[PDB]
């Protein structure tokens, strides 16, 4: 099975539908469709991604379905439940990361101090 | 609170991501939103509220909602809720103590040495 | 789909009642009835059809209207204490072959002899025991609405601002605080059971509401207590870990810890720009 | 044309088969019969219908109704049965409409009560904690079995309700309760339930507390301000380490 | 035809009519119903694959669920204007601890 | 039980990196001083 | 229009409605009126001010509304939503109190270290 | 477990004042 892929920027969530790669693909979203409507700037359907600007997790949480065009919106079989927590100028890092970044610091405070010593004694 | 009187926001709180949002009463499908008079957006039917983000940050301010027939009257919304507030019980004035007679210790056996 | 004026109505003795029931199936029989702990369903007023007025079991003290096909009214002309009890309004088709009756939702009506006697309840919570959270790793919470009159009310928990319909058991029936002696108030209680780990975390709200259904505003208040009109009541309640490390001690610690270290900074700057000047000073004069 | 229910009140266990009787007689011969349930809300709803001259007992889901129309006996079958079914139960018959006899009659109504399989049994009297808004002393008796039935209190100031039964979805526990309270100084509920035949090995808790910090830690959560907080703190302590760094330095310069 | 997910006090079930076969991700634990799967409580982004079948009028056919969280227990919220500020704060930094150094070097 | 960028690791790892400091200093200086 | 006025000072919240001068004033917390000649210290009116003592978060917050006797309480035309926490010793931790602690203690600081430094050249 | 802070500030604070006296002592002690 070939999930979805879901990627979070921000407040811009974008949705990648994998299972229809040579066809035009609908989203629908808690039996309502959803994108592809030219309009609703927040809301957006290009090539086979649906991507959804200004998230809020109250009301855009829920079920996600991708179908292709012409077919019946029940025959589908894959859903995805969705439920993320948006924050503006919010960055996720994990402990590893930080401590790479002040050991990294320490050393590089190190070197240049050395540097400078050895430059300095000399003459 | 009474809709009779154009009193139209309410205020939908205690949320388990601490955000504080505002509930207009009008039917109309798009709601555009007032802070101290000057515009701050709009809404259309997918979205029913106005987030003004979490409670931490104190948000005050008068607001006003508008979907079709006019304005509503104006809801004063003041936050308190001591995010940086400081209990000054024993612990804290003990190592507020320690730690300034430590330094200047320190310190002063510094700028005894460095004297003459 | 048969709908009732209402759910819940209070009116003094000697007023003028009146209900109202509306279908939408294209019915033609149409029943009122009347229950009554211990007697069970009673006929009170029967329609064939349009402008049909006929007699049923209890038909004394009532009156009808049904001027409208889709429409069947009920009046009490002289309410009295007599006729307290929950009403319900049932249509059918012609011909018992295949026509059921279908029911609506019912009012429950409350005929007293004087206003004074419809007071609000009073909600309380409490919160669970230690002693069930370390013996079973559970919580249960308790919610109690006293001292109201009549029993009209409504009861609900609201967790973190949302309904909870799991782990609630609430009483079936209000009961009365003096059964003996008459004109008694009445109780309700509730509980709500939870998970130890979830009720201990200080960032969880429990609410308990309780909707009271009183008198309206159309109705004359000559006392100086304030008017029991329907309202809403309300107790809350915050997570509670009286022993152990939550959050608000370590964003305590955290900003003392804060305050503590700016302080600390600004002296070691204070020194190094001390120091800086000393030397600078030295440098100058030794030339 | 009458109809009567014999039994007022049945109990049953849960996951079980249930059948409430209904014994009617009637002059005409076309009628029909049909149930309906009434929950504590007070609804009426209608469950099965049946005629006279049909074979092929009708059935819902979880009903059935066995007819006998030598023995003139409709009775309702209730199959796996849930905690839903509690409600009051009455039965109903038609009749002709054409003479003079339209008026639908209806039973006296049964209720029906479900009981839950415990599975585990640990009944206890605990006390819960004041309520700084109220001076009523309340304490819960709670986790007893079934068959347990709790008694009225013959004292004018004590308040007992009936026993509740209460479904836990989250780890899919049942459980019975009860609740009593007083306004009176003496209220040591260790003697509340004294009316009642509570079982053996109750458990009474000790006024001392009991703590389990593991149990405490286990519901820790942060959020975005606590961990910029705490980077904060770090990035404090390295600029002062930095800052005492170049101190000790200058200071070892001009010693002396 | 979508495998219902519930939300509990504070964890997520996935819930179906049969048993739960699981595809790929969180392994989750059983309740000792089968008919239920317990995914954890939510902040602990709990995400997965999961397959069952149905029931009544759904004999024959699957259904397949991707559960995704994503809730910010490691998120912060980082202007770029105060990282701008934290960066020249660290090069003033050590480059006065090498104008420390140097100074000290001589003697 | 989350902790997030809260963890202890990561004020002890300053303290880890400030002890492994002291104590190879403190041995370089003890060196000295008894081969001085 | 004016807005209330909100001053807290430990666990007393004072409340003061600048609308309707010179008439008095009546007050609602919740569609209950409060501040009256009710048997209660806790809270107090007086002409223009209400006064919430050993306040509550989770009782007292909420919508609060000011009118003239003889009216209406929908025909005032501001509610208040007012959510606070109280503390007896909580001083609050804001920009200038952290600068004026900073500036305070980096004057004793460097008058002491000064004054030791004249100190130790004197005796040196 | 262990996650109460106050531990690791007092740990920090001793092993700051420690280094950089031993800093000291022995940058004299080499040169
Ligand atoms: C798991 O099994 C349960 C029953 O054990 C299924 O719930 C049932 O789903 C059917 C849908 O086929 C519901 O029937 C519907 O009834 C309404 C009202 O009469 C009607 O308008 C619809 O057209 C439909 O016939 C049925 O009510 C419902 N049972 C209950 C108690 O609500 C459920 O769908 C099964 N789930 C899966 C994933 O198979
Ligand atoms: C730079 C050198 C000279 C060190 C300065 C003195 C040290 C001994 C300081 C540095 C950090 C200080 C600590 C920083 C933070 C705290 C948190 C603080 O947390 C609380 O428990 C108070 C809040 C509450 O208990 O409600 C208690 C004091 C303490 C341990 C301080 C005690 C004294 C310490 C270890
Ligand atoms: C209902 O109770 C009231 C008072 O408890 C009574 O109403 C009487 O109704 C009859 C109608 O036959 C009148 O003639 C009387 O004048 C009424 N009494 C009063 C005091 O108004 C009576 O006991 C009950 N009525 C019925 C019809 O059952
Ligand atoms: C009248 O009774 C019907 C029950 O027959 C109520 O319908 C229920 O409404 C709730 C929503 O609150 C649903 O969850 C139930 O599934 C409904 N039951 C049925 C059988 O449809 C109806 O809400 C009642 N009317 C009022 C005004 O409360
Ligand atoms: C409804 O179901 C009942 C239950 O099976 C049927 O009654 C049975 O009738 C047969 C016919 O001879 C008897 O052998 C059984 O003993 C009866 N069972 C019971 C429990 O009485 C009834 O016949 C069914 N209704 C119709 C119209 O056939
Ligand atoms: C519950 O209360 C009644 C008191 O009369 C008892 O339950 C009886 O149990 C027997 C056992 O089969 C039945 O035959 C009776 O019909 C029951 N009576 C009633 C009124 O339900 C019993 O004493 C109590 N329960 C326990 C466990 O003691
Ligand atoms: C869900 O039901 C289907 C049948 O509807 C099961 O598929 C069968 O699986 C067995 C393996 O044991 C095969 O031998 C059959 O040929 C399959 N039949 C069909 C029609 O696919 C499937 O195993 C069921 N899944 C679960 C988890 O029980
Ligand atoms: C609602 O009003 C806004 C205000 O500009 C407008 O942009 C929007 O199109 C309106 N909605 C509809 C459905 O016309
Ligand atoms: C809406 O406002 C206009 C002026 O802004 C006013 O003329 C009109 O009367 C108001 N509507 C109502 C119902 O009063
Ligand atoms: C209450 O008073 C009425 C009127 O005197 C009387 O009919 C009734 O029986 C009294 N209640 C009880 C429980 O006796
Ligand atoms: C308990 O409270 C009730 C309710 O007001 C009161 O009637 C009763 O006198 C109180 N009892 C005591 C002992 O205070
Ligand atoms: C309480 O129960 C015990 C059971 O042994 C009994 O002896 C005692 O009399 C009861 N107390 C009262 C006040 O009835």
């Known amino acids: 099975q070939t999930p979805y892929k879901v990627s979070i920027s921000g407040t811009t969530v974008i949705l990648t539908c994998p299972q229809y790669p040579g066809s035009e693909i609908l989203w629908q979203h808690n039996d309502k469709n959803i994108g592809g409507d030219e309009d609703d700037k927040n809301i957006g359907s290009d090539e086979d991604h649906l991507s959804l600007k200004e998230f809020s997790e109250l009301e855009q949480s829920g079920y996600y379905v991708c179908y292709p065009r012409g077919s019946k919106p029940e025959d589908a079989n894959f859903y995805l439940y969705l439920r993320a927590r948006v924050c503006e100028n919010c960055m996720e890092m994990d402990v590893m990361s930080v401590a790479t970044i002040v050991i990294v610091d320490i050393c590089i405070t190190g070197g240049l101090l050395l540097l400078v010593y050895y430059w300095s004694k000399n003459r | 609170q009474s809709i009779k009187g154009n009193h139209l926001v309410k205020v939908y709180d205690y949320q388990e991501d601490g955000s504080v949002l505002l509930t207009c009463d009008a039917e109309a499908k798009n709601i555009t939103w007032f802070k101290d008079g000057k515009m701050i957006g709009f809404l259309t039917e997918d979205k029913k509220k106005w987030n003004l983000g979490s409670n931490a940050k104190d948000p005050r301010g008068m607001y006003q909602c508008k979907g079709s027939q006019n304005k509503s009257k104006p809801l004063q919304v003041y936050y308190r809720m001591c995010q940086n507030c400081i209990e000054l019980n024993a612990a804290t004035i003990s190592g507020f103590l320690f730690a300034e007679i430590v330094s200047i210790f320190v310190l002063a056996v510094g700028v005894y040495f460095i004297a003459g | 789909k048969v709908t009732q004026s209402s759910r819940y109505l209070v009116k003094r003795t000697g007023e003028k009642v009146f209900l109202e029931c509306v279908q939408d199936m294209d019915h033609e029989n149409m029943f009122w009835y009347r229950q009554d702990p211990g007697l069970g369903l009673r006929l009170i007023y029967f329609?064939?059809?349009?402008?049909?007025?006929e007699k049923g079991d209890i038909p004394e003290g009532y009156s009808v209207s049904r001027e409208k096909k889709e429409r069947f009214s009920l009046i009490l002309e002289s309410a009295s204490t007599n006729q307290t009890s929950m009403y319900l309004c049932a249509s059918s088709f012609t011909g018992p072959y295949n026509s059921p009756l279908h029911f609506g939702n019912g009012t429950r009506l409350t005929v007293t002899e004087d206003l004074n006697k419809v007071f609000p309840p009073e909600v309380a919570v409490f919160e669970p025991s230690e002693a069930e959270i370390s013996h079973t790793q559970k919580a249960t919470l308790v919610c109690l609405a006293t001292g109201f009159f009549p029993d009209h009310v409504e009861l609900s928990w609201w967790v973190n601002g949302k309904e909870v319909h799991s782990g609630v058991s609430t009483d079936p029936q209000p009961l009365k605080e003096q059964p003996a002696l008459n004109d008694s108030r009445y109780c309700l209680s509730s509980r709500l059971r939870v998970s130890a780990t979830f009720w201990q975390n200080p960032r969880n709200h429990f609410r308990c509401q309780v909707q009271f259904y009183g008198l309206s505003e159309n109705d004359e208040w000559t006392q100086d207590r304030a008017k029991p009109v329907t309202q809403i009541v309300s107790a809350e309640a915050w997570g509670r870990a009286d022993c152990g490390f939550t959050s608000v001690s370590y964003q305590q610690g955290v900003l003392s810890a804060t305050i503590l270290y700016e302080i600390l900074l600004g002296k070691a700057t204070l020194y190094a720009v001390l120091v800086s000047a000393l030397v600078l000073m030295a440098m100058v004069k030794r030339k | 044309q009458k109809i009567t229910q014999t039994q007022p009140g049945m109990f049953v266990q849960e996951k079980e088969a249930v059948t409430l009787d209904c014994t009617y007689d009637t002059s005409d011969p076309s009628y029909g019969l049909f149930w309906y349930k009434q929950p504590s809300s007070g609804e009426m709803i209608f469950l099965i219908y049946?005629?006279?001259?049909?074979?092929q007992n009708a059935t819902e889901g979880r009903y059935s109704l066995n007819f006998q129309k030598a023995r003139k006996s409709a009775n309702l079958v209730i199959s796996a049965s849930q905690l839903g079914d509690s409600a009051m139960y009455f039965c109903?018959?038609?009749?002709?409409?054409?003479?003079?006899?339209?008026?639908?009659?209806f039973g006296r109504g049964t209720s029906l009560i479900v009981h839950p399989n415990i599975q585990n049994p640990d009944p206890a009297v605990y006390q819960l904690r004041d309520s700084k808004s109220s001076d009523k002393s309340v304490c819960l008796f709670t986790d007893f079995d079934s068959q347990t039935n709790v008694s009225q209190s013959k004292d004018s100031d004590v308040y007992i309700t009936d026993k509740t039964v209460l479904d836990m979805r989250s780890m899919d526990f049942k459980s019975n309760s009860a609740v009593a309270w007083s306004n009176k100084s003496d209220f040591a509920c260790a003697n509340a339930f004294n009316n009642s035949i509570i079982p053996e090995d109750t458990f009474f808790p000790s006024p001392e507390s009991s703590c389990d910090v593991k149990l405490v830690e286990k519901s820790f959560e942060t959020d975005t301000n606590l961990n910029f907080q705490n980077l904060s703190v770090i990035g404090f302590r390295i600029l002062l380490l930095k800052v005492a760094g170049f101190n000790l330095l200058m200071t070892l310069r001009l010693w002396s | 035809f979508k495998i219902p997910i519930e939300e509990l006090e504070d964890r997520v079930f996935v819930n179906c009519n049969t048993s739960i076969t699981w595809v790929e991700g969180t392994v989750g634990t059983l309740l000792s119903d089968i008919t239920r799967l317990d995914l954890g409580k939510r902040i602990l982004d709990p995400r997965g694959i999961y397959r069952c079948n149905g029931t009544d009028i759904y004999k024959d056919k699957e259904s397949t669920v991707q559960v995704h969280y994503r809730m910010c227990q490691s998120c912060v919220e980082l202007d770029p204007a105060t990282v701008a500020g934290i960066i020249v704060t660290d090069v003033i930094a050590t480059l006065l601890l090498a104008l420390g150094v140097f100074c000290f070097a001589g003697h | 039980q989350s902790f997030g960028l809260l963890d202890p690791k990561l004020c002890y790892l300053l303290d880890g990196i400030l002890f492994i400091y002291g104590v190879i200093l403190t041995a370089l200086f003890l060196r000295v001083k008894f081969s001085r | 229009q004016t807005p209330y006025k909100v001053s807290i000072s430990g666990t007393t919240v004072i409340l003061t409605c600048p609308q309707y001068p010179g008439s008095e004033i009546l007050w609602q917390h919740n569609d209950k009126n409060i501040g009256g000649d009710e048997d209660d210290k806790n809270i107090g009116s007086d002409e223009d001010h209400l006064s919430l003592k050993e306040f509550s978060e989770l009782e007292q917050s909420g919508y609060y509304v000011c009118y003239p006797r003889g009216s209406k309480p929908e025909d005032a035309n501001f509610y208040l939503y007012l959510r606070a926490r109280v503390c007896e010793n909580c001083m609050e931790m804001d920009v200038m109190s952290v600068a004026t602690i900073v500036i305070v203690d980096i004057c004793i600081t460097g008058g002491l270290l000064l004054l030791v430094y004249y100190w130790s050249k004197n005796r040196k | 477990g262990l996650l109460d802070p106050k531990l690791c500030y007092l740990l920090d604070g001793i092993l700051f004042i420690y280094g950089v006296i031993l800093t000291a002592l022995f940058l004299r002690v080499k040169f």
């Open positions: 329609s064939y059809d349009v402008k049909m007025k």
């Open positions: 109903a018959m038609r009749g002709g409409g054409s003479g003079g006899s339209y008026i639908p009659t």
């Open positions: 049946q005629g006279s001259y049909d074979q």
